[PDB]
Amino acid sequence: GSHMGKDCIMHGYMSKMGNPFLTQWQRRYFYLFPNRLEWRGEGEAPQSLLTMEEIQSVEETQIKERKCLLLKIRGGKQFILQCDSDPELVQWKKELRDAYREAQQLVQRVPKMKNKPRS
């Protein structure tokens, strides 16, 4: 109620993409918001605006010691998180996890066509 919020939580360079064909990753600039999230960089596109109310579960993978991060969407899509920074992604996740979590717990009380005018 107009007291304290959190706009841009974490921003910077974040590589994410590929899944079925993990041969070459791509570094792109993203922005983890309190609900939204911008994804831009090289190439081009008509739009690149997303939120944080879909992801199914965020986690990181390892390989003998360390691999890369992961970002599975509950929509049916998947993404491979990767960065040169250990914390970066780390922090991204922390803020990300919640981003996806909150969105959930926030979209938890979702009536599947009922309304129920009291009873």
Domains of the chain from N-terminus onward = 1-119 (2.30.29.30)
Nearest to 87 by CA among 27, 18, 12, 6: 12
Nearest to 80 by CA among 22, 30, 38, 41: 22
Structure-solving method? NMR
Question: Rounded to the nearest 5°, which phi and psi values hold at 77?
Answer: -105, 165
